[PDB]
Design a binder for this molecule. Structure first.
Ligand SMILES: Cc1c(C(=O)O)cnn1-c1ccccc1
Ligand SMILES: Cc1c(C(=O)O)cnn1-c1ccccc1
Ligand SMILES: Cc1c(C(=O)O)cnn1-c1ccccc1
Ligand SMILES: Cc1c(C(=O)O)cnn1-c1ccccc1
Ligand SMILES: Cc1c(C(=O)O)cnn1-c1ccccc1
Ligand SMILES: Cc1c(C(=O)O)cnn1-c1ccccc1
Lengths: 153, 153, 155, 157, 155, 157
């Protein structure tokens, strides 16, 4: 009965996130993606885009969440978070939250290294580049791309 | 059928390592500690010290290993490594090995943040301090302590 | 007569801060904690000062004052030229390193950093407040004097 | 016909920036300083003021020119027939952040980025910190070119 | 006439190195790859030079030479005063930053760093050799010219 | 009666070290420079040579003295009735490494450690790099005190 939660704003989900979801799904019986909550996409849109892109992952589901992440995790009977890291400075920042989360609620955090190809990918940078006309097609799920083009027009 | 391998030299295993073992054991059905191979303790001694300290973990076992870590992992039907991180610079160094390991053999790596109390603990520093008479009792399993005092006399 | 200033917003003071205060008061004849007022937070400056005084009652060579504007002026105005601050991480050091070099360049005021006690490496005022706002228990990270008042502000 | 673009907000230009300009100008046939403006947030200095302050302190660099722009930096670079950006770095933290943007810029436009290490004397200089310190009366004259410092005190007064 | 030196042991050259060579040759009129001999490794200096020449056949403005001793002497002896190097990480930058500042201080030679291509962020000569020694397949990380010879040295 | 210990191998002492000594001497009633010797590996300079080079360049610091030692630093500190160490740091990487040792030292002996940021001019100076560069003929005279530089060239010759 193993399981982890993968949290984030996912505004929108990127190939970097999807890679983390896939890897978490391969190592834990149950994965829940926690869409935490105003950016570009609504909660429902963000959830839909992730569901579309994770259809090949039978042991993953997507839910919105509010309040403390540890409460979200524990209220579903789990006590692990899985999170992707690019740096370095990411680890330092996330370490603080991870130790706090373990301290207040006994919830552990497992970090995975980003796939090399997506080291430079972030939701913020993808939206920024796309806004000014740059091609970010290779960095986002097929569905997501189109939806993003939609929001910009 | 989930599982991870926890690798290291463990010369000797510290409370920092034991904390990682416990956390891995709580999230994966099967944990294997891979004692990799001349420091202070022999392979057999290192294995024994870990077995002594992990008796309360029914789903963990301890084995020696040689060659590529990914071969050790895959030859036991697994494809996850779990490793503890203190920094920062640890993440940078380990990220390189993690991406290499994923590339050559499809083996993933999950990192956990060190418990705050053991941020300064390393096998090397514990042996160094103990050698010159410093008290490292609070940083090592009870059994290990005594064995270390033994080697020094 | 040696001395140092320990600056911060301390909104609220944490056990991490208090550890730094204690270690500074152990090594300098005089320590001044400077509670820096800004454009802002949860506690008033007077509330912050009083919480620090309560937690530092056992440190006779430390006192608490409010400050505004340029830190090196605050320091020099009081006949001192050293700052003492805690650091938790490497990136703590890199940001603080810039300010320390700037402060020494513009006023000849030096800065001494101490490493966090391991137990408080993850505590910050911001994170403590955020966790407490949503019902998380941060009593082990804050002095007794703070935890009671923090409950009051959230109710 | 080699060339590079040195981008920034330069609000204001610092001695650390000028060091980078000089080092780029010494290694590329032409250098363009790109003053990148956010049309949605004014800085301390207007675009013409930023350009003036840069020109006045680069007068001895014959192969350098100064132009403003906005939007994607890689478009600024490519429309001038170049494909190199040169930027200074102070810390490992700077490099991790800039690495993201450099790899993105190479991905979307094939434009490369060359980083140079700050001169030691300016490792702590930034436009924002110099403005903040000057706002509260601190002396930052040794961190800024002469073209900048009294213009800066003027803005604050 | 612009130019730069790309220094390293290149034992063996990787696709990461080659990416840096290509990017340097695209931006400077002349590039010299300097294969630095030391007290040592898997390949002879001549083997290393020949592997780089094979992988850089399409770069007419780049040439490969061996070097010994102080790098800034090598650079200045050839009428240049720029070094170009790849960086993979922040801690790459911090170590290289020291040497770059030293090299500019002692000889006025500057250093330009380029960020690794994402695909090769984890590749190093040391790790490639180590993996290959134990049967791991590193063919995707090394030029074709290297992978054949690496197999030979291990057999 | 405040005091601090400034530890190192000082093989040789650099201008970066001397900056740290001066800053410690300005803030503590007494400073002891601790020349820590590894009885198993000789450096470039003998203990007496290291001490001499330090004394000659700290002659204007009346509250500083120089002593050698080996073994645990915290024992050196405590046997002098002190419990503060002062050390310079250059980078975030330095801090992570030294943080480990500082926390260990506090754990085993209650001895505290105060770090100071390097002077910008010396951020790239290290004993090892200065020796390595000098070995191959590079000029490192501006990074070392006068008490050191020609002694160093002597060793290399
Ligand atoms: C952090 C991140 C974002 C973001 O934070 O916006 C978007 N993608 N990724 C990402 C996640 C894992 C690996 C690579 C990239
Ligand atoms: C890395 C390490 C060593 C070592 O590498 O020698 C000994 N303990 N630990 C450790 C492991 C996890 C958490 C804290 C400390
Ligand atoms: C920096 C800090 C904050 C803050 O930034 O608000 C709150 N506590 N601490 C802290 C201070 C010293 C040691 C550990 C933690
Ligand atoms: C990054 C920077 C700023 C800024 O970002 O505001 C102002 N100066 N510098 C600088 C540039 C190169 C070297 C040193 C300093
Ligand atoms: C640094 C390095 C080595 C090495 O250090 O031996 C081998 N490849 N690379 C590399 C170079 C540029 C980009 C990526 C990787
Ligand atoms: C660390 C160091 C060394 C060394 O470790 O060899 C030589 N100088 N410095 C130094 C000390 C303080 C500031 C700058 C530099």
């Amino acid at each position: 009965m193993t399981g982890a939660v993968c949290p984030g704003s996912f505004d929108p989900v990127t190939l970097g996130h999807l890679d983390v979801f896939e890897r978490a799904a391969a190592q834990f019986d149950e994965v829940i993606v926690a869409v935490l909550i105003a950016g570009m996409f609504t909660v429902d849109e963000r959830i839909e885009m992730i569901r579309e892109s994770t259809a090949d992952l039978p042991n993953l589901r997507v839910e919105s969440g509010q309040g403390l992440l540890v409460d979200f995790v524990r209220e579903r009977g789990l006590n692990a978070i899985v999170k992707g890291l690019r740096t370095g400075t990411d680890f330092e920042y996330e370490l603080q939250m991870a130790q706090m989360n373990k301290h207040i609620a006994g919830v552990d955090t497992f970090f995975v290294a980003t796939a090399p190809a997506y080291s430079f990918v972030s939701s913020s940078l993808a939206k920024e580049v796309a806004t000014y006309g740059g091609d970010v097609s290779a960095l986002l799920p097929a569905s997501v791309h189109q939806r993003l083009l939609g929001k910009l027009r």
